[PDB]
Amino acid sequence: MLTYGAPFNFPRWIDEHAHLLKPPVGNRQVWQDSDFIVTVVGGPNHRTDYHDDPLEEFFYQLRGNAYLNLWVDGRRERADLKEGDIFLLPPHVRHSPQRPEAGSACLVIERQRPAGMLDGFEWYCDACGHLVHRVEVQLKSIVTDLPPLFESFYASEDKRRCPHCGQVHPG
């Protein structure tokens, strides 16, 4: 059986879910209970966290532009997702998606994580560059298991305190 339904027009599906791509949401998963996690991510968004995904992440910037703040070879690189770009992120490259444009839409595709394969969410210090805080999480909900993580980092000056220079991250 076609568990996930029949083919349907993607542009128009993105149109009909525009208002849920705008904040306060941003995310919208296409099919539920599937192995491939297929999401459309709009803008504008608020992210200061770096994601440490134990599996690959496919990107296709369908509308508008966005960029990924990265940690590549110990440096703070930036990878731009201009409209029409596709990209395959290798496992565990830290990345912080910035989506400044309202009405943008990026197809993001990932894999359900097997039990014991944890996602990481880290913040780094603007001053000294050291790791400020890391939460590891057995991700079940690419859309709803992240904000409590975030809220609790923003709510805790201690979690935000850099252990190398003491500067409290802004959150």
- Shortest spacing between CB 69 and Fe ion, in angstroms: 17
- Shortest spacing between CB 162 and Fe ion, in angstroms: 3
51 is in an annotated binding site: yes
Within 13 A of 16's CA, how many CA atoms are on the CB side?
Answer: 7
Cα 91 to Cα 107: distance, rounded to the nearest angstrom: 18
Residue in the structure block whose two tokens are 């990026």: 106
Helix H or strand E segment including 153? helix 147-154
Cα 44 to Cα 100: distance, rounded to the nearest angstrom: 5
Nearer to its own copies, 59 or 123 (CB): 59
Residue in the structure block whose two tokens are 């394969």: 117
Q: Is 155 in the site for Fe ion (CB under 5 A)?
A: no
Q: Which residue, 122, 120, 100, 99, is CA-closest to 169?
A: 122
Q: Which does 106 bind (CB under 5 to 8 A by kind): Fe ion, its own copies, none?
A: none
Helix H or strand E segment including 70? strand 66-70
Nearer to Fe ion, 76 or 164 (CB): 164
In a 10 Å sphere around its CB, with 0-12 CB exposed, 13-18 middle and 19+ buried, how is residue 141 labelled?
exposed
Is residue 159 helix, strand or coil?
A: helix
Q: Is 72 in the site for Fe ion (CB under 5 A)?
A: no
- Shortest spacing between CB 108 and its own copies, in angstroms: 12
- Shortest spacing between CB 157 and its own copies, in angstroms: 35
Is residue 21 helix, strand or coil?
A: helix
Q: Is 34 in the site for its own copies (CB under 8 A)?
A: yes
Interface region with Fe ion, contact rule CB under 5 A, candidates 15-23, 29-37, 86-94, 120-128: 120-128
Q: Which does 128 bind (CB under 5 to 8 A by kind): Fe ion, its own copies, none?
A: Fe ion
Known binding site for Fe cation: residues? Answer: 51, 57, 95, 125, 128, 162, 165
User: Binding-site residues for substrate, please?
Assistant: 57, 99, 110
Binding footprint of its own copies on the chain (CB under 8 A): 1-4, 6-13, 30-31, 34-36, 38, 55-56, 58-61, 72-73, 79-82, 84-91, 93, 107, 109, 111
